[PDB]
Amino acid sequence: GSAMGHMPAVDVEIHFPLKRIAAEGYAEDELLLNQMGKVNDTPEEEGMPLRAWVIKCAHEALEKNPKIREVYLKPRAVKNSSVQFHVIFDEE
Length: 92
Known about the structure:
Entry title: Chemical Shift Assignments and structure of Q4D059, a hypothetical protein from Trypanosoma cruzi
Number of strands: 3
Keywords: trypanosomatids, neglected diseases, unknown function
Assembly: monomeric
Radius of gyration: 14 Å
Strand order of the largest sheet: 1-3-2
Number of domains: 1
Structural class: alpha+beta
Order of helices and strands: EHHHEE
Strand content: 15-25%
Distance between the termini: 38 Å
Largest sheet: 3 strands, mixed
InterPro entries: Q4D059-like
Helix content: 25-40%
PDB class: unknown function
């Protein structure tokens, strides 16, 4: 509306190379690391640990239903409330 104060709802969209996130040795994919490293220093929730859980959750989420495109993740620190990680799977 006509009240541009502050929007407390933070959506952070991460991108995972579909091929590497669906593989073992994913941490060797420079993109996966640099993308999660891009959202790691000030991601509102934790940081490096969040990368670990996000990558794990997205890894399993993709593998258990490997016909998707993207998922929306809710921080394990659910108390953080108005924050979401939108994990998108890029075909590289």
